[PDB]
Design a protein around this ligand. Structure first.
Ligand SMILES: CCCCCCCCCCCCCCCCCC(=O)OC[C@H](COP(=O)([O-])OCC[N+](C)(C)C)OC(=O)CCCCCCCCCCCCCCCCC
Ligand SMILES: CCCCCCCCCCCCCCCCCC(=O)OC[C@H](COP(=O)(O)OCCN)OC(=O)CCCCCCCCCCCCCCCCC
Ligand SMILES: CCCCCCCCCCCCCCCCCC(=O)OC[C@H](COP(=O)(O)OCCN)OC(=O)CCCCCCCCCCCCCCCCC
Ligand SMILES: CCCCCCCCCCCCCCCCCC(=O)OC[C@H](COP(=O)(O)OCCN)OC(=O)CCCCCCCCCCCCCCCCC
Ligand SMILES: CCCCCCCCCCCCCCCCCC(=O)OC[C@H](COP(=O)(O)OCCN)OC(=O)CCCCCCCCCCCCCCCCC
Ligand SMILES: N=C(N)NC(=N)NCCc1ccc(I)c(Cl)c1
Ligand code: SF4
Ligand code: SF4
Ligand code: SF4
Lengths: 176, 145, 69, 101, 312, 231, 155
């Protein structure tokens, strides 16, 4: 089923012809266009007062990465490398060995945040909720090197943001 | 004549900030003189306000503290100053402020939040976290040729 | 909100208002409190030069009435 | 003498502003002849000139209306404007007002 | 005392020009559902000052000029003429009371096109020159109608003195007997001053050269926008003048000028841009025929109604 | 025949598109698009990814119509896999496919008007775009590159309360189209910039490989949602 | 004293230059759209003094918003060389920051900082319009720290 957007016949009776003549000479449609912009001048603007106001985000928002822990403080990551395998950008680099207590843990866990596409595939693939994308989006830097995160940076992000990260996971994990 | 009742609302903002100095202080710090309900105040001095008659987006806001972690933030405020427990509320990821539903306490969670540290002596510097992989042979110290 | 455009409008208003106000007041100051005499034509200029001589002080804006008769 | 003073001040200030706009940034130390241009644009300039000349003859009209010879004044005033309109009609029909090609 | 008068005219003009930038950005903002400047100073009131300082300590543009003397000349020409256009304006008393004040302003406005031309020669670039010629062709074209429209109105006023327009409009604005001309005059001032929907010099600078101080050219352009709108108010929306309370005239006359200037703002916010050939056709094939016909009509009308104004 | 090629004897950079045009006065005699300025070898990079890994590359093609790009790739893989997505996933994909169409046509129409001077509808409508970015962010956590539509269905279910907000947004949106039309449709200046411009015949459009509105603008009755429907 | 004078002259020009940051945007790809949303009414970059559409001749900051290919690298460097000083560059998004999702491509420059110096890196693919606003406000604070005159005085 279809419709015509511009298949109309302009009436050629004197009343209609004079209506278009008055339009041409008196600029009626142009003045009508002025009315619309005038009505907007008196509308409340939609601007928000950043940084004192923030745009709304949901619990699923994909932001800065962080490595999480268990309630006891043990790291959740077990160096399974499923995150590294799935990363579409190859942004993750992992090395691992048996820890002094025999645990399976990483010795290297880097994310090149300038390779990362912030797709969230790593947090989907992780079997233990170790790597997440947190709610922070205000971590712009002055140098390139500051954006090449290693494990110490990523663990510090987790300790820094765990309060919010845990609440966000609590809100969304029943959809996963 | 609503003009007068509009103007009265204007004056009540001056008293709502505690006199002209308070009204001027928020006008020049935050470029806004609205009055909202105090929802709480974090340990760093940031005050969080709500006004549910404002359209979604402008109904929550923070008046940042004038000093955080030893830094003068009277004029230099920053979005990264908001701690995580309030970050969720301020960005509408939740309805409940931390004053009502506080976060789950953990041993390892930072007690002191830090804002963005780029460009300062505290900035992050990347490095390889792995140890040397190939060990070189060390020649003997006693002579023997 | 739209009335926050007014402060800038008010500053422009005051800025455009001063030229017209300054000129009017300087004219009264310089012309014995009256309007500066307009002399677009030789007749109007001639009466002004005559007034300057009749004044006795070399100022065309110092009128002399029946007290001189 | 007032017009000279006003003119002198207007351009002296314009000149003063221009030079400091030329040097104030230097207080810092930051480290063949036929233009390929359509003949249609020449005719616009010439057409403007000829219409500008005719407008010069119409400028005295406000004073001309003050005469007792109003029958001749009105006839010649309309004659000039009509010829000015005939020139436009000639350019128009001769495709001199077009920009295609 | 007269020098005190000259400065009391120049300095406020440059300040009103400065704060028109703020008003333009804020009126455009609210018509676009946003705010515009509101951070740099309360309600953005310090924004014009920040911009002025920033421009004047910016590095000069680095393309070499093709004519040093004529590089300096263009900005001086443009700004000097812009300030000169204000000396005969009766607000209600002119700085200089010219018997032929209208002719003076017409004559000075026709020389402001030289700055456009000269800046083309000094650009040392053919594309810059071709751009300068296109703007000149548009400018001079709309000068034709402005002069003829101006002449038509003067046939109800009776002289070239500007203060006589105040006497003419004692009982009634000239926008009533001459609203057809006011419509065309207003649009010509938009196209005369390269204002949307006639800002094609910057419309056609697009894609898909030695340049003077942007600030100096910008100030000249915006002084002309205010002056054009002040002139429109005096010519069509005449304010009553009470000799004993002149400031009453200066208040109402200012408000009319502010509203007319704000309408320039209102109009760039509302319409798209004409094509170059189409705004040439708007003049040569639309405004000029009506303007010629209405010039004929306004020569006849005083004579046939016995409404010829006096000379003085 | 003046020329504009963006090079020596022409100091100016080109940008995303390098158009080499030869003009005779005002008229365009030849228009020679030089592209490749955003060529990134996506098609080669996909050969090193798994099918899931290659999905985010499609968000970044028509980066105004992200979820529609995901849908086309997902349909192709589902066809080769010989599976089908469940009905709720197909309805979610049609829902966000049409939301994505609103995102694209707002961008297309308002930037087209902006490029020729009418700068104001861009602001009114980009507030609507901002609200639709929130629907993207609420279902996927990303405002643009959702990676939400995948072979097999969609990544996650709609959060509770999302459908109500989409209803609220849609209830008011037609009035925003009306305001856009009040600025453009009958404006004589807009009509003078677009009427009888770039006329293409029905036969030329087909033989030149056009599709979508480029075909329907010339009267051809074709729309794959009708003739070759999916989901 | 002369120290106190240069202290306030520094504060003045620094205040002027960060209150009037005029960007020219290389909208190369996706990230340009988020840049447009920052100009859009919700965030209204123009309210910070950051004008929306600025000619390159009058620009103070360049925003590289999108992938920089090999074929485009010479054009980017051309425009940068023509910007009058002081000039700053903001790198927006993973592509411009370091190649991003096309880092290993044969036709893609692995970070615009290989072609021009960069002052701020905004992470994200793409950064939210508000994330880009954070980076712009962080550039203002970087300008606020400048001390050209105090260093000149001590030469
Ligand atoms: C004529 C000369 C006019 C001089 C303009 C004075 C500038 C006033 C000013 O700096 O604003 C206060 C500014 C305001 O600070 P701000 O620029 O950081 O803004 C803070 C408010 N928010 C968070 C919204 C951005 O004070 C300063 O930052 C110090 C600069 C002083 C420069 C003046 C030196 C003289
Ligand atoms: C009793 C005897 C009486 C005898 C005298 C009778 C005379 C009165 C009757 C005649 C009325 C004359 C009208 C004069 C105005 C000029 C009208 C005009 O020229 O319009 C035509 C023009 C082009 O129209 P177009 O669609 O392109 O079609 C023709 C092209 N071939 O259209 C255009 O002008 C293009 C529009 C340009 C303007 C766009 C931007 C501004 C629009 C809003 C401005 C609002 C007006 C502001 C008023 C200012 C007041 C100070
Ligand atoms: C005051 C600011 C002007 C804008 C606010 C008014 C908006 C408005 O009322 O315009 C709509 C009206 C009708 O326009 P239109 O439908 O195209 O014409 C058909 C029959 N006239 O337009 C009009 O009819 C107004 C006529 C304008 C002509 C007078 C200008 C000289
Ligand atoms: C309507 C008109 C309104 C105009 C208002 C304009 C206001 C202008 C305010 C300007 C304030 C004075 C400062 C002038 C600008 C200088 C800014 C600056 O950054 O100066 C840096 C300059 C370079 O110093 P440096 O390169 O380190 O040392 C080289 C010496 N061989 O160091 C110097 O050498 C400076 C000496
Ligand atoms: C009272 C009743 C009036 C009845 C007379 C109406 C005349 C209409 C003439 C006409 O319709 O011609 C239209 C057409 C202009 O349209 P266009 O597409 O440019 O074609 C150009 C062809 N030479 O053809 C034309 O060329 C237009 C006519 C030539 C231009 C004449 C210009 C008019 C003179 C300007 C002054 C106005 C009248 C006197 C003042
Ligand atoms: N607002 C506009 N008219 N656009 C625009 N160029 N804005 C920039 C503001 C500006 C430009 C020149 C000067 I001198 C000043 Cl004081 C301020
Ligand atoms: S978000 Fe995507 S691109 Fe970034 S590290 Fe995780 S899987 Fe890799
Ligand atoms: S973060 Fe998760 S997916 Fe990645 S290596 Fe550790 S346990 Fe495996
Ligand atoms: S960084 Fe991401 S959003 Fe930006 S251009 Fe690259 S792929 Fe697109």
């Amino acid at each position: 089923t279809y419709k015509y957007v511009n298949l109309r016949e302009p009436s050629m009776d004197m009343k209609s012809v004079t209506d278009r003549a008055a339009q041409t000479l008196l600029w009626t449609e142009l003045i009508r266009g002025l009315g619309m912009t005038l009505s907007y001048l008196f509308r409340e603007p939609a601007t928000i007062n950043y940084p004192f106001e923030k745009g709304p985000l949901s619990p699923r928002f994909r932001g800065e990465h962080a490595l999480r822990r268990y309630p006891s403080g043990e790291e959740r990551c077990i160096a399974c490398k499923l995150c590294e395998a799935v990363c579409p950008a190859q942004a993750i680099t992992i090395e691992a060995e048996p820890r002094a207590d025999g645990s399976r843990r990483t010795t290297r866990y880097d994310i090149d945040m300038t390779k990362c596409i912030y797709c969230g595939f790593c947090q989907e693939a992780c079997p233990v909720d170790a790597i997440v994308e947190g709610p922070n989006f205000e971590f712009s830097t002055e140098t390139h090197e500051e954006l090449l995160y290693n494990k110490e940076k990523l663990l510090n992000n987790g300790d820094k943001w765990e309060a919010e990260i845990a609440a966000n996971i609590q809100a969304d994990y029943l959809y996963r | 004549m609503e003009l007068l009742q509009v103007l009265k609302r204007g004056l009540q903002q001056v008293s709502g900030h505690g006199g002209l100095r308070g009204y001027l202080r928020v006008l020049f710090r935050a470029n806004d003189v609205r009055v909202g309900t105090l929802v709480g105040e974090d340990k760093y001095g940031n005050k969080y306000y709500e006004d549910n008659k404002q359209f979604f987006g402008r109904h929550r806001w923070v008046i940042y503290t004038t000093e955080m972690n030893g830094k003068n933030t009277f004029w230099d405020v920053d979005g990264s100053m908001v701690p995580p427990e309030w970050h969720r509320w301020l960005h509408c990821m939740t309805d409940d402020p931390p004053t009502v539903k506080p976060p789950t306490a953990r041993k390892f969670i930072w007690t002191n939040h830090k804002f963005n540290l780029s460009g300062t002596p505290q900035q992050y510097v990347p490095y390889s976290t792995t140890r040397k992989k190939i060990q070189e042979w060390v020649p003997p110290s006693t002579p023997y040729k | 909100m739209w009335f926050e455009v007014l402060p800038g409008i008010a500053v422009m208003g005051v800025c455009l208002f001063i030229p017209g106000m300054a000129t009017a007041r300087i004219h009264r100051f310089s012309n014995g409190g009256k309007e500066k005499r307009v002399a677009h034509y030789p007749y109007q200029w001639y009466l002004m030069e005559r007034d300057r001589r009749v004044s006795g002080v070399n100022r065309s804006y110092v009128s002399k009435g029946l007290e001189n008769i | 003498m007032n017009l000279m003073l006003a003119l002198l001040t207007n351009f002296t200030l314009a000149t003063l502003l221009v030079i400091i706009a030329f040097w104030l940034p230097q207080l810092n130390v930051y480290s063949s002849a036929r233009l390929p241009f359509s003949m249609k644009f020449f005719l616009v300039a010439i057409t403007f000139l000829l219409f500008d000349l005719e407008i010069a003859l119409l400028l005295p009209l406000p004073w001309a209306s003050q005469t007792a010879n109003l029958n001749t004044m009105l006839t010649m005033a309309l004659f000039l404007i009509i010829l000015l309109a005939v020139s436009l009609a000639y350019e128009w029909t001769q495709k001199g007002l077009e920009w295609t090609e | 005392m007269f020098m005190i008068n000259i400065l009391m005219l120049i300095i406020p003009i440059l300040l009103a020009v400065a704060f028109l930038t703020l008003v333009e950005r804020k009126v455009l903002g609210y018509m676009q559902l946003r705010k515009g400047p509101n951070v740099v100073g309360p309600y953005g009131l310090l924004q014009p000052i920040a911009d002025a300082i920033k421009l004047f300590i910016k590095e000069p543009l680095r393309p070499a000029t093709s004519s040093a003397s004529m590089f300096i000349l263009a900005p001086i020409m443009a700004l000097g003429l812009a300030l000169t256009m204000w000396i005969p304006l009766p607000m209600p008393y002119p700085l200089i009371n010219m018997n032929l004040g209208v002719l003076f302003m017409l004559a000075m406005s026709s020389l402001a096109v030289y700055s456009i031309l000269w800046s083309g020669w000094a650009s040392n670039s053919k594309y810059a020159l071709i751009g300068a010629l296109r703007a000149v062709a548009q400018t001079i074209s709309y000068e034709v109608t402005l002069a003829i429209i101006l002449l038509s109105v003067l046939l109800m006023s009776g002289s070239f003195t500007l203060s006589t327009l105040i006497t003419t409009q004692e009982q009634m604005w000239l926008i009533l007997p001459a609203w057809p001309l006011a419509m065309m005059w207003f649009i010509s001032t938009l196209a005369e001053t390269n204002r949307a929907p006639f800002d094609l010099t910057e419309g056609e600078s697009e894609l898909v050269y030695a340049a003077g101080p942007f600030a100096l050219f910008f100030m000249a352009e915006y002084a002309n926008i205010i002056m054009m709108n002040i002139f429109t108010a005096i010519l069509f929306l005449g304010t009553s003048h009470n000799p004993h309370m002149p400031e009453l005239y200066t208040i109402n006359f200012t408000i009319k000028s502010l509203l007319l200037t704000m309408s320039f703002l209102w109009i760039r916010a509302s319409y798209p841009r004409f094509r170059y050939d189409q705004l040439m056709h708007l003049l040569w094939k639309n405004f000029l025929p009506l303007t010629l016909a209405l010039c004929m009509w306004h020569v006849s009308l005083p004579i046939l109604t016995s409404g010829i104004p006096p000379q003085t | 025949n003046l020329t504009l090629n963006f090079g020596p004897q022409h100091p100016a950079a080109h940008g995303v598109l390098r158009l080499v045009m030869e003009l005779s006065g005002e008229m365009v005699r030849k228009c020679d698009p030089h592209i490749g300025l955003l060529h990134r070898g996506t098609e080669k990079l996909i050969e090193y990814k798994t099918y899931l890994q290659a999905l985010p590359y499609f968000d970044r093609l028509d980066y105004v119509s992200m979820m529609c790009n995901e849908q086309a790739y997902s349909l192709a893989v589902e066809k080769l896999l010989n599976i089908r997505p469940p009905p709720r996933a197909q309805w979610i994909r049609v829902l966000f496919g049409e939301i994505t169409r609103l995102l694209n046509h707002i961008m297309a129409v308002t930037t087209h008007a902006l490029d020729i001077g009418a700068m104001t509808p861009f602001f009114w409508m980009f507030e609507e775009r901002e609200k639709m970015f929130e629907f993207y962010e609420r279902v996927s956590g990303a405002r643009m590159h959702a990676a939400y539509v995948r072979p097999g269905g969609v990544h996650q279910d709609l959060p509770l309360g999302l459908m109500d907000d989409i209803y609220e947004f849609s209830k008011n949106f037609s009035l925003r189209i009306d305001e856009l039309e009040e600025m453009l449709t009958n404006n004589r200046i807009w009509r003078n910039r677009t009427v009888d411009i770039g006329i293409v015949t029905a036969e030329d459009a087909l033989n030149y490989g056009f599709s979508g509105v480029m075909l329907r603008g010339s009267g051809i009755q074709w729309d794959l949602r009708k003739t070759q429907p999916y989901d | 004293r002369g120290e106190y004078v240069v202290a306030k002259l520094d504060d003045l020009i620094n205040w002027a230059r960060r209150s009037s940051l005029w960007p020219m945007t290389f909208g190369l790809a996706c990230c340009a759209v988020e840049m447009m949303h920052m100009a859009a009414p919700r965030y209204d970059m123009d309210r910070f003094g950051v004008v929306f559409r600025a000619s390159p001749r009058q620009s103070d900051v360049m925003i590289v918003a999108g992938t920089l290919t090999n074929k485009m690298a010479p054009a980017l460097r051309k425009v940068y060389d023509q910007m009058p000083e002081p000039r700053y560059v903001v790198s927006m998004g993973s592509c411009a920051n370091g190649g991003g999702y096309y880092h290993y491509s044969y036709s893609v420059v692995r970070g615009c900082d290989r072609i021009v110096p960069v002052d701020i890196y905004v992470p994200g693919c793409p950064p939210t319009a508000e994330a880009l606003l954070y980076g712009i406000l962080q550039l203002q604070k970087k300008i606020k720290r400048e001390k050209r005159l105090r260093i000149w005085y001590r030469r």
